Write a protein that binds this ligand. Structure first.
Ligand SMILES: CN[C@@H]1[C@@H](O)[C@@H](O[C@@H]2[C@@H](O)[C@H](O[C@H]3O[C@H](CN)[C@@H](O)[C@H](O)[C@H]3N)[C@@H](N)C[C@H]2N)O[C@H](CO)[C@H]1O
Ligand SMILES: Nc1ncnc2c1ncn2[C@@H]1O[C@H](CSCC[C@H](N)C(=O)O)[C@@H](O)[C@H]1O
Ligand SMILES: [Mg+2]
Length: 311
């Protein structure tokens, strides 16, 4: 079972983590793999060779944080390292649904894609709902005065704190809780890589939590959003006969009465035997004329061709 490892970033001092993060950044994804890169690829490594790379303190920090485990003759890691969009990120390896622990963290299934979709503006307060590994928080860090990540998974929170510290990000904070409960005040930016996929209405687990998690999210968005602010959501949507997702969404948001503008960019579609349709897409709330617009934009298709073409 994968996703139950103990993660304790508070056990390493801030400078030491940041230095580790710098060491990771120069080797993870390098064409010339070092012990550190091997470690973060899931390969057992010689601790002595590791020690030559990150020093004795770096070695101990790996252990104390839970980033490495002493097998006996080797170190290995339960985590996998990634470098993207200027940050390093550790998360769980990508594994089949049946072997995922309750507290398994999104292995970056879509994050790299979503960051390419994200608007480039900055502002005062940003909120990353269901922050997981923390990845979307990390890239918001340099253009927002503060970033808050929330997750109900306590291991995700620990992992996000770790990743923020690896990247030296002072203005990035994480709270454990249920949706908006720990998120005080309003935010100029709210991002949500929602735990919705194939489960429809029903809760399966923390990564497929059902449509009610979207209803909770959008019902509360207007009271958590700074006017003029921006909301971005990766989500699965179900259209049923006489019951399209977009009309449930408009109701949750109080779209007309609040005068909000919503754009849904639908990338993937699959008709269902109901006569309905499953969709995956990208939803944006942003200033503009009141209303909801849905356009078909195969950005997954584009991303497969050239990721840089969503730039
Ligand atoms: C944070 N939002 C996410 C959302 O991005 C979405 O991610 C999808 C993944 O789940 C899916 O992975 C599946 O195929 C993998 C490899 N064969 C297996 O290892 C695993 C298995 N799940 C990807 N192939 C495609 C993604 N679009 O759905 C998540 C809930 O399932 C949801 O939490
Ligand atoms: N009640 C709720 N409150 C906070 N987050 C929740 C939740 N139910 C699920 N989540 C979290 O939503 C996250 C979705 S996974 C996405 C993680 C990260 N933002 C990324 O883009 O890679 C999971 O970590 C899951 O634990
Ligand atoms: Mg699951």
């Amino acid at each position: 079972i994968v996703g139950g490892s103990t993660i304790q970033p508070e056990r390493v001092d801030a400078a030491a983590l940041r230095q580790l993060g710098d060491a990771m950044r120069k080797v993870v994804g390098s064409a010339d793999p070092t012990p550190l890169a091997d470690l973060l690829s899931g390969t057992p490594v010689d601790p002595d060779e590791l020690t030559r790379e990150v020093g004795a303190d770096g070695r101990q920090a790996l252990l104390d944080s839970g980033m490495a485990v002493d097998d006996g003759t080797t170190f290995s890691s339960p985590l996998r390292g990634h470098q993207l969009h200027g940050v390093v990120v550790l998360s769980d390896p990508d594994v089949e649904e049946e072997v995922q622990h309750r507290w398994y963290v999104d292995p970056l299934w879509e994050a790299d894609l979503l960051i390419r979709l994200m608007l480039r503006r900055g502002g005062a307060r940003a909120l990353d709902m269901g922050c997981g590994s923390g990845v979307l928080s990390l890239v918001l860090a340099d253009r927002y005065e503060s970033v808050l990540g929330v997750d109900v998974n306590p291991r995700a929170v620990a992992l996000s704190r770790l990743n923020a510290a690896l990247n030296g990000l002072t203005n990035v904070t994480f709270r454990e809780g249920d949706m908006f409960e720990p998120a005080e005040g309003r935010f100029s930016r709210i991002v949500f890589n929602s735990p919705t996929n194939e489960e429809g209405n029903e809760f399966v687990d923390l990564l497929e939590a059902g449509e009610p998690i979207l209803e909770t999210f959008f019902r509360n968005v207007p009271r958590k959003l700074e006017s003029g602010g921006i909301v971005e959501v990766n989500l699965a949507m179900n259209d049923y006969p006489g019951d399209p997702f977009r009309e449930r969404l408009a109701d949750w948001l109080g779209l007309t009465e609040n005068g909000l503008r919503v754009q849904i960019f639908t990338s993937q579609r699959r008709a269902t035997e109901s006569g309905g349709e499953w969709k995956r897409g990208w939803l944006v709330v942003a200033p503009g004329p009141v209303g909801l617009t849905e356009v078909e934009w195969p950005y997954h298709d584009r991303y497969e061709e050239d990721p840089d073409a969503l730039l």
